[PDB]
Amino acid sequence: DDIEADHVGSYGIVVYQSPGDIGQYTFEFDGDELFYVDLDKKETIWMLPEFAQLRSFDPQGGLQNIATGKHNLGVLTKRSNSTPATNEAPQATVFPKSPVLLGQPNTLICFVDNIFPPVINITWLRNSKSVADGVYETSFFVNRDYSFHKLSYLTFIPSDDDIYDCKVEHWGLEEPVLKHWEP
Amino acid sequence: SADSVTQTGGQVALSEEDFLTIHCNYSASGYPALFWYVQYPGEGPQFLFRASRDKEKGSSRGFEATYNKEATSFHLQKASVQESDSAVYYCALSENYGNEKITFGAGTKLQVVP
Amino acid sequence: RGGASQYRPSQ
Amino acid sequence: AVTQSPRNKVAVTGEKVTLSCNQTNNHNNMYWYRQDTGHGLRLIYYSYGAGSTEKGDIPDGYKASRPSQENFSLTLESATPSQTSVYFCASGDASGAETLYFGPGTRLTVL
Amino acid sequence: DSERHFVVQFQPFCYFTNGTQRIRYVTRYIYNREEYLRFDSDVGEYRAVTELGRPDAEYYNKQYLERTRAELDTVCRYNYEETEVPTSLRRLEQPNVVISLSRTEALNHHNTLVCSVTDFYPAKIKVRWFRNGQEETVGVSSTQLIRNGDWTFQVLVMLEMTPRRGEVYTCHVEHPSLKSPITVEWRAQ
C-alpha cells in the first residue's frame, strides 16, 4: 500500500488540536526533521544549524497554514458531530547513540512510537530522580497510520552505578510508563 | 532585495478597438504565483486572474497573461479595448512560501480615448 | 527560501 | 463586501488616527495597504485571524488590531504628513495565492 | 466530557524518483487520525477518502485544482532543486566502526563478534565480515537499521565465530561518505 520513491519531502505538515489551540508545523525530508516553526517566537527552528545557512523558511508560512488548521479544526469537528479522538498507548524503546564506554560522554535515546493524540511528556530519570539538564527532543514525526513518534535525548556519562529510565506520560496510559536501561 | 514587480511607466493612451499590452516583469526569490488587478475610478483594485506556474495562462473578460519564467514576465493582453477599460492595472505576486503576503507593482494608468 | 504546500481551507 | 470607515479624513500632525475595516465575507485574512503615486500599493499590516496581527512591508508609524473575524483596524498613533495617502483594506480566504477583495478606500490627508 | 480531544492533520508528500525526473505529489487531509480527503497528482484531482470528505471534494476541485496541481512544481521540484540539493542530498556523515567480542575469549570456543557501525548518513550502507582476508557469509546477521533522529543512523552486524591461533577478523564498511572502505581488525590473542 505504501508509496515508494528515492526521496520523500513533506513541506508543511500541520497538526492543530483543541482544546488548548495546540499546533505544530514541520518540514520532513526522508523521515528526518528539517525544522519546526516556533509559533510563539515566530521563528524557524532547524534540527541541523548548518542547513539554515544554505536554506530557510519564513515562519509566516507556518503561521498561515496553522491558522488554516484552526479553521479546518472546527469545520471538521462540527461536521463529525464532535467525534473525539481515540487514545492509543505509546511504546518506548531506549538505546545509546554510540557504543557505551566507561566515562565516555554519550547520549541516551528514547524512541516513542504509536503516539496519539500528539500530546505527551517524555522525561528522564537517573537513579529514580528526574533529570532537568541535557535533555532535548524532536518534534512529533508522522506515521503511515497517522499516529506519531518522537525521540528524546539525554546526555550522560556511562557509569557502573547509574540507572536510567525514560518516563512517558500520556492520556492513553493510566500511569506514567517507565522504560528502564542500564549499561 | 525584496520581491518586486516592475510594470510599464505611468500612463498610456489608446483608441477604442486598439490592442492592449501592459508589461510586467518580476524579481522574486522563490517561485511566486502571478496576478493582475484592475482599479476602476473611485474603487479599490479587483482581482482579474492568477497563474501559479510557468506557461500557465490566466484570463478574464478578454484580459489574459501567460506566466513566462524565462523572461520573468506576466504581460497583460487584451484584443480590443473599450472606453470602459480606462483604469489602473496592477501586476502582483505571492510566494510559494505560504506567506500570503501579496506584493503589488506601481500600477499602469490606461486611458482609452473616446 | 523554501516553499510550502498550502493547507487549503474548507467550507 | 468590504467597507471602510471613514471614507475621508483630514488630520493634523501628531493626531491619533484610526481607520476601520469590516468584511462580511467571513474571510480569515485581512490586510491594510496604502496607495501612493510611484509606489503603487504597499502592504502595511495584515492578519491571519482574530487576535493575530502581522507586520507588512512598511509597518513603521502604524499599528493594527484584529479584535474579531469581521473587523480589522489600522491606527496612526502620531500622524505625520508622510502618512497622507489613500488606504485600502482587503480580505481573503487564506488559500495560497488567494485573491484579495478590496474596499473602496479611505483618503487620508495630514495637514 | 471536557476530556474530549479533537485534532486535524495536514500531511503533504513530494515523492521523488531518479532526481526530479519523476514526482508524485500527494496531499492528505486528516481529522483526528482519519484521512477524509486527498489530492494525488497521479489521480489529478481531489477525492473524498471517506464520507467525512464528501462535502469538500467538489469545493476543493472547483477552487484549488490548478493551484494544487502546480505545487508539484512550485513546491516539490522547486524545493528539491533549490534547497535539498545543497543540504540533505549533500549530507555525508562517515560511520564510526568498532568491534567487540560478546563472551570472554576462549581459544577454540564459539563466540560472536559485534561490529557497531554508528553515526552515519545517508542510510544506505554495506558491512562485510572477513576471516583471514576471506569474506564470511555464514553466521552473519544484523540488527535493524536505526534512525537516531538527528540525521544519523546506526546498525550492529554480528559474526558467529570460533577464535583460533593467529586469526584476524575484519569488519569492512562501505558508504558514500568514504573515499575508501573502513576496515577494523580484531585479532585472536
TrEMBL record, chain B:
It comes from the Eukaryota. The keyword Transmembrane does not apply. Residues 3-94 form the Ig-like domain. One of its GO terms (biological process) is adaptive immune response. Disulfide bonds join C24-C91. The keyword Signal applies. One of its GO terms (cellular component) is T cell receptor complex. Keywords: Adaptive immunity, Immunity, Immunoglobulin domain, Receptor, Signal, T cell receptor. This is TRAV6D-7. It comes from Mus musculus. The chain holds residues 21 to 112 of 112 of the full protein.
Automatic annotation (TrEMBL), chain D:
GO terms for biological process: adaptive immune response. Disulfide bonds join C21-C89. It comes from the Eukaryota. Keywords: Adaptive immunity, Immunity, Immunoglobulin domain, Signal, T cell receptor. GO terms for cellular component: T cell receptor complex. Residues 1-89 form the Ig-like domain. The keyword Methyltransferase does not apply. This is Beta-chain. It comes from Mus musculus (Mouse).
